[PDB]
Amino acid sequence: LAEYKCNTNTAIELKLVRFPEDLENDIRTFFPEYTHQLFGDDETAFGYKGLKILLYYIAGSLSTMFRVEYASKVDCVEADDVEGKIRQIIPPGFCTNTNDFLSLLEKEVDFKPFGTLLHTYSVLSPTGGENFTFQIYKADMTCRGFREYHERLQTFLMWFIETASFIDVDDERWHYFLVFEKYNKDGATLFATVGYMTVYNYYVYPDKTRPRVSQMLILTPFQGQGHGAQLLETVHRYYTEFPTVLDITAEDPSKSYVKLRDFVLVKLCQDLPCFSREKLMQGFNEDMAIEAQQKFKINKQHARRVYEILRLLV
Numbered sequence: 001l002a003e004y005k006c007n008t009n010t011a012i013e014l015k016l017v018r019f020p021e022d023l024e025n026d027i028r029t030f031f032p033e034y035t036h037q038l039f040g041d042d043e044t045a046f047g048y049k050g051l052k053i054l055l056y057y058i059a060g061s062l063s064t065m066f067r068v069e070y071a072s073k074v075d076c077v078e079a080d081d082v083e084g085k086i087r088q089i090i091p092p093g094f095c096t097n098t099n100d101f102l103s104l105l106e107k108e109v110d111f112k113p114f115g116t117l118l119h120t121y122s123v124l125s126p127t128g129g130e131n132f133t134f135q136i137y138k139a140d141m142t143c144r145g146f147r148e149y150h151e152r153l154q155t156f157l158m159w160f161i162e163t164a165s166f167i168d169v170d171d172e173r174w175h176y177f178l179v180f181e182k183y184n185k186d187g188a189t190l191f192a193t194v195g196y197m198t199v200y201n202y203y204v205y206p207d208k209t210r211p212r213v214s215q216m217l218i219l220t221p222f223q224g225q226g227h228g229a230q231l232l233e234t235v236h237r238y239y240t241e242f243p244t245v246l247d248i249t250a251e252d253p254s255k256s257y258v259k260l261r262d263f264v265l266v267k268l269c270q271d272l273p274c275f276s277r278e279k280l281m282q283g284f285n286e287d288m289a290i291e292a293q294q295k296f297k298i299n300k301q302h303a304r305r306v307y308e309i310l311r312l313l314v
């Protein structure tokens with residue numbers, strides 16, 4: 001009976017599929033960092049030998065294939081309801097075989113990003129020379145198709161963020177920022193989902209808001225390319241255009257958030273007059289927090305952090 005225990009982290013094969021060959025290419029597969037919300041602290045599932053859970057997503061639209069496969073199952077002993085648990089966290093309408101999934105691949109040419117283009121950037125390839133092209137969009141639930149797309153996307157929070165939980169999309173104070181990569185296929189330019197960030201537009205009495213970063217997910221294949229830095233920079237630059245925004249902060253200031261934040265705020269602030277070599281040496285001044293707030297909606301306390309870093313650099 002213990003011979004029917006399978007670790008679920010390694011059993012759940014995720015894929016982002018651009019071309020048919022991606023189905024057969026194990027390099028394209030990645031795996032959950034967390035499955036405890038479905039399978040407990042032990043991250044094991046009872047009842048199956050050779051358990052394979054397939055969640056294949058078409059790279060842009062995230063149209064989904066979901067299949068459970070196994071060598072054998074125990075079915076007066078009852079296997080864990082793997083299917084049922086996964087169905088809690090993914091929308092209906094998934095297909096269940098590779099043929100139907102490949103059919104969806106043909107229609108992917110028509111998939112277009114949701115919302116407003118805010119920024120376009122290039123990342124250099126590891127090999128060097130080739131640039132990949134990326135775009136950040138701001139979307140909301142008024143954009144046709146986005147709600148369904150967000151349901152397909154958010155599942156990933158479960159696999160890669162430890163304390164992850166789904167948001168209430170009917171709350172209009174949610175802002176969505178999406179990252180896409182442009183890629184070529186047979187002469188056409190298609191879009192691939194890279195990541196996203198949800199930002200909550202907290203009300204501040206009486207006429208102001210204070211955006212707070214809630215979640216940010218960069219999908220595993222795109223990690224270590226600087227997407228989070230672009231995403232946060234873009235969000236700061238976006239909300240700067242609104243006088244009614246006080247500042248931008250994070251709900252959950254992790255070590256990695258703080259590292260990312262310190263990177264971006266230094267990038268944004270080093271070329272400002274108030275943070276010049278000469279002005280830094282005179283000490284920290286309220287002027288610095290003022291200018292940082294006006295120019296990039298940087299929190300008063302965050303500007304103190306930037307000051308220390310910049311003053312060390314000098």
Ligand SMILES: CCOc1cc([C@@H]2CC(=O)NC3=C2C(=O)C[C@H](c2ccc(F)cc2)C3)cc([N+](=O)[O-])c1O
Pocket residue numbers: 160213214215216217218219222223224225226227228229249250251252254256257260
């Ligand atoms: C080799 C590892 O490469 C990367 C890892 C990450 C992770 C993983 C992920 O998907 N989410 C985030 C990450 C963080 O480190 C911190 C971030 C965070 C941002 C804002 C905020 F308000 C609160 C948290 C959440 C991002 C990137 N990236 O480039 O963005 C990696 O390259």
